[PDB]
DNA sequence: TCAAAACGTCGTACGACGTTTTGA
DNA sequence: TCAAAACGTCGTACGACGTTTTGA
């Protein structure tokens, strides 16, 4: 892993709280078992100018990276082990956004018993949904009961 | 005048990074002498549902108030002498707003010295447009050049 | 099949201002 | 003539999804 130190910890946990983003996806894709990826996005949208500051961001840190879009770039961290890593250690510091934090980390250590069985894939694109829920969701297209559809 | 814990004050200098407002209006009015009041402001905005953590910031921070703006909620500080002491403790730990706050820090000293000498309160007027140059400014109205062709 | 990356999308919410009153 | 509260309101990011690709 990484160890992170607690001062820096508890800036992020603050600077998250505010102005990050904890994303939790069902994809459709016909490659996977059940036709749907699980992905865990944490991200964090600046303005390009600023652009610096997520640099600095991905250096501290250490893993993800920065994604130019034109006007705004983002700080990406879509790597499950770190993620598990990095949302660990900064749980404890959360004000606002722990709980999310708290699902994140139960999808993925969860994450290879649910590729077994479909029923407790389900389970799992549940907390997909909580998370959702915590957030202010606009586009949500898949859901878990999206899924529940095909899986029969 | 409250010393802040640094704990408490690293994850609020985060959090104001991310989620903060640091705002410098001059706004006219005809009260004053001339014809403008100098007000800084330091508020952060959440979800009403999300309101205790704003109480929590009355409490922590100990000066300051939170207004219900109806689905959403305003922690309002306003108060020169609190916002200064507060604004001191915090700005070290600033990264992205860190300009911002010594700017105000900065205009707090010089007020005074701004309420006798126009052109002096010229060179203070000049500080609040510095500080809407560093936030990207939308609505922006009255400015230094506004109050000084009227000096 | 899977973890990741790469990339496309858009309606409004709220930051950052306003204006005007209170209570000295 | 002040500080400080009260209250109002708009433009363009941007957050939280989305689809598709990559390479083992």
């Given at each position: 892993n990484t160890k992170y130190n607690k001062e820096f910890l508890l800036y992020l946990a603050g600077f998250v709280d505010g102005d990050g983003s904890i994303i939790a996806q069902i994809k459709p894709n016909q490659?996977?078992?059940?036709k749907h990826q699980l992905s865990l996005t944490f991200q964090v949208t600046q303005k390009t100018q600023r652009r610096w500051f997520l640099d600095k961001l991905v250096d501290e840190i250490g893993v993800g990276y920065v994604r130019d879009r034109g006007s705004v770039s983002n700080y990406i961290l879509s790597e499950i082990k770190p993620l598990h890593n990095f949302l660990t250690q900064l749980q404890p510091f959360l004000k606002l956004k722990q709980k999310q934090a708290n699902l994140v980390l139960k999808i993925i250590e969860q994450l290879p018993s649910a590729k077994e069985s479909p029923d407790k894939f389900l389970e799992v694109c549940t907390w997909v949904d909580q998370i959702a829920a915590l957030n202010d969701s606009?586009?949500?297209?898949?859901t878990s009961e999206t899924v529940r559809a095909v899986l029969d």
């Open positions: 490659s996977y078992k059940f606009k586009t949500r297209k898949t």
